[PDB]
Amino acid sequence: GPSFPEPKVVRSQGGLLSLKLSATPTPLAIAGQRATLLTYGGSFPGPTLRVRPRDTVRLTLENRLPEPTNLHWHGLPISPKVDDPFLEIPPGESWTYEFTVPKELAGTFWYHPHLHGRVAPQLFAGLLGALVVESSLDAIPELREAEEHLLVLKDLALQGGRPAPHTPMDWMNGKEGDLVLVNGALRPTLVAQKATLRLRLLNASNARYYRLALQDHPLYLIAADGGFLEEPLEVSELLLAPGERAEVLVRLRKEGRFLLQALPYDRGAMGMMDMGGMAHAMPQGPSRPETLLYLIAPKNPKPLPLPKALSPFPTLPAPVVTRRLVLTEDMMAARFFINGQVFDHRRVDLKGQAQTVEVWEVENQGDMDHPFHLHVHPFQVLSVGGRPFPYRAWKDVVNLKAGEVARLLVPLREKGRTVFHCHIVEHEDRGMMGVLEVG
Amino acid sequence: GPSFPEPKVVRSQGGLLSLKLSATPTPLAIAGQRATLLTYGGSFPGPTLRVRPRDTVRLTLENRLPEPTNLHWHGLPISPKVDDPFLEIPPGESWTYEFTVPKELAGTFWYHPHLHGRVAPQLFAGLLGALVVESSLDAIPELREAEEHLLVLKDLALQGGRPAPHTPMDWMNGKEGDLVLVNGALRPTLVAQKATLRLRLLNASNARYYRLALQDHPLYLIAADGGFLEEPLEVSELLLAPGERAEVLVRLRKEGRFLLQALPYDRGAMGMMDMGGMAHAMPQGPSRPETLLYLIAPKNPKPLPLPKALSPFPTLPAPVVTRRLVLTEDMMAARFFINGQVFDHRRVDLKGQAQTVEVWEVENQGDMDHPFHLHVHPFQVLSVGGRPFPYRAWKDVVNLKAGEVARLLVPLREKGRTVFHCHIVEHEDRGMMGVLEVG
Ligand SMILES: [Cu+2]
Ligand SMILES: [Cu+2]
Ligand SMILES: [Cu+2]
Ligand SMILES: [Cu+2]
Ligand SMILES: [Cu+2]
Ligand SMILES: [Cu+2]
Ligand SMILES: [O-]
Ligand SMILES: [O-]
Hints:
- The structure is a homodimer.
- The first copy, chain A, has four helices and 36 strands.
- The first copy, chain A, has about 450 residues and is mainly β.
- Chain A folds into three domains: about 1-135, Immunoglobulin-like (Sandwich); about 135-310, Sandwich (Immunoglobulin-like), CATH 2.60.40.420; about 310-439, Immunoglobulin-like (Sandwich), CATH 2.60.40.420.
- The first copy, chain A, has a seven-stranded mixed beta sheet, with no helix packed on it. In chain A, strands 27-26-29-34-31-32 form a six-stranded mixed beta sheet, with no helix packed on it. Chain A has a five-stranded mixed beta sheet with strand order 1-4-9-8-6, with no helix packed on it.
- One copper (II) ion binds near residues 72, 74, 112 and 423 of chain B.
């Protein structure tokens, strides 16, 4: 096959992407070993769905798992009556999701389970895939002539040929695995044929962070979770928290082999130790560095010029309300809270008005990083930790280090009941989620 | 008695104003005629209560009317568990209101009934009185040396020796009377002994407006409904809508007699006419001019200098929400609405958070003037009709002409359920009221 493994793509046909997927335990070859994973469409990752604005998606999910499941269309600004976080598909049953892709939309999105209390083991086991919304912007020569690839960043641990079970410490920290994979492959080689690469990046891990850096090269950020920036932004490294996406251009500078690494990063995970009068929690410290893939540049690379502009960011109406959401932890109990409460599906926490804009101040009063996610309503990050964000783009996950406050501009779009929660999915399962109702 | 009639004053004693009032039908002499009014304390107006910050008020209201009644402590920022708009005192029964006068408070306030559906006839019949909160500011020589008077502006109509009954047209327009009185007197004479007068003004009428102007003189506004301005403001005239208060300094310029008038003003009241194929509503147009009192200046008046400053207005925290309240009318039905609804005591319309600040945009989409009142939480008027307010001071009633939007800064103070409503009291009785809950 191609030196660089990427999930199979399924494209809409005549404006319709009609597809039946099954969620099923699947024997497969993974990183040189045989294992049984839980997959969509018989593969890990699941197939990449590629659509355009205004397309119709008709996706029938058949549940062949021994437990209930459902889908979250992560990042898509569609109705929560379709992207329904409360829906349960029992074992053996099917459900058809049908929606129209919004007209003003572009970027890399993804699908995965969202059945409260069961997300972490289901996602860890292999249930996820990407969804790409193609844009007319993709036709500008600076992008069209680039070599494009999707990189699904997901780690895994195996035990007895199956995903390793969650331990109590996993429910506290969020589970990370020793197999740090790209598109389900172990340190693949990307042999570039063009000097400019366009890479769509997805962190589909439960809890692992990727502090991305390519040896000897900067990255040019061109899209965040939910859409393009206004112009490219040069960065020396790029942190991708669980659930986040980004698109970057890479401008290969000379011939050779360059490592794409996940550099050491301390997200505040904890261990336990006993030193003589102890049995207390202790920081794990930063992750060990990982090589994600080997990038081989072509002969005499002459990269394209960068695009001068991408997509202007919408001018938003003045906000009509300010909200405060405070995140806290009870680590030893593995309980996690928003404004002092755990999730209750029957309780509405915030009531907002469709087509108004709100300011949300999300404050992390815990010691761990928490990546905060809001369904249905993409947001503009104004600042984090008192630092203004260096670009305007739509995001749907924002990472908060210990103590940091994120200020978000949140236009409320589709009416209905939806959720916001930490995207360390173990924390969501353990209570760190709330309910927003838009009317 | 004194050439200028003013209500009897009752003052706190040793930090306590403990008083038993009765609401009772009372035969009295009024404007040269014998009539039976409904009064507090056997007089019209009721007695003026004069207190200082931190005083305790203990007022036992005995209901000797044939219908239920209660008290609203208009303008006082106290608890709605005390100033309770839902409380009913049945005929023959008593209730004791007890509260502490807030420390940061000064100005002219008032008390009157607020039993939904019965306010207009009870207020029209004579049930009201003033409450003055004395301030240390009253000791500055520019105020202390002024001659002070209260002017309670209230009109009346008599029929068969009793207040005239409400007609259907009265419920639509709000009732006005032909006897336009000051402190219950018909065009009294004020023989000034000092060149500077300090006049505390109260519009305690159901619906009549007073476009105040003193012949040959400007007025110097020093306080609005709920407190002092920051410095005196010179005005050529001053409109007082129902429920509003103001305090002004008058600087008598020469010897002579000067009329204080209520100049013509069109508040949009309506009549009906039939011209040949008709039976349709027609504007009443502006009120006829009224003389309120005769002011006689002393010999060789040399008024005091004006105070250079009064009270700095508090710096308010940034607001956390913006509200929109739209007022509309169904004139022929005599029904009046806020956001398309009539009052329902069981329904909460707005829920806010104590100690936060809100912006309220109140929009009059009707054709009549409506003076909008909020209980419990005094506000700062930022602008009306797109025109910035020329001073900072606490208000609790804001007049809106047809089409105008008022923008208010509303700090939420005491917790509990309270109301906002039009202070043309017939409109309140006929539905133009809503419920605010502060938690
Ligand atoms: Cu997600
Ligand atoms: Cu978390
Ligand atoms: Cu979610
Ligand atoms: Cu009042
Ligand atoms: Cu009104
Ligand atoms: Cu009221
Ligand atoms: O999610
Ligand atoms: O009132």
